[PDB]
Design a protein around this ligand. Sequence first.
Ligand code: HEM
Ligand SMILES: [O-]
Length: 154
Amino acid sequence: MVLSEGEWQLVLHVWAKVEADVAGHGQDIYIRLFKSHPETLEKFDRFKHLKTEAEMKASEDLKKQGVRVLTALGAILKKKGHHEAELKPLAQSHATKHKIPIKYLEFISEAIIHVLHSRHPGNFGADAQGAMNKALELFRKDIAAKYKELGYQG
Ligand code: HEM
Ligand SMILES: [O-]
């Protein structure tokens, strides 16, 4: 599975807009994920008690977590497929420490696409969304292969 350079440029052009305010984007993505698929919130021991969107928005720890996730994902995207080193620690923690199935990675990918589609119509038209979907599918395909190497079904 391989993206073209043009596809990577569409991914990186919208990611540059995320980077104007990574914290705010992270909050929107987590709120979308937890509202759409409430079961995913149960995996977060520090945040599973949050009851409403207002509580999620006011959580400084959730905001910091969103920054960590999007910055890690941004570093992966900037490797344009050459992300073996970045995926090692992430696959190990998500398979063995956090126990995050591939289906939940699909759910957060959907939340990312939903938020970019809402916030960034200037850089998230159909071709750009297609490229981002391809990049996230590549990420999940490579994470799933590493999960299997690590002993986790996913
Ligand atoms: C785009 C996909 C994702 C990325 C890039 C990502 C990235 C990260 C990073 C960088 C950390 C901190 C270091 C670590 O423990 O590895 C983290 C922690 C964590 N991740 Fe993810 N993650 C992703 C998806 C998910 C999903 C979908 C879930 C659950 C449904 C999840 C559950 C967790 C939990 C529970 C923690 C620990 C949080 C805490 O310290 O309170 N991750 N993630
Ligand atoms: O995460």
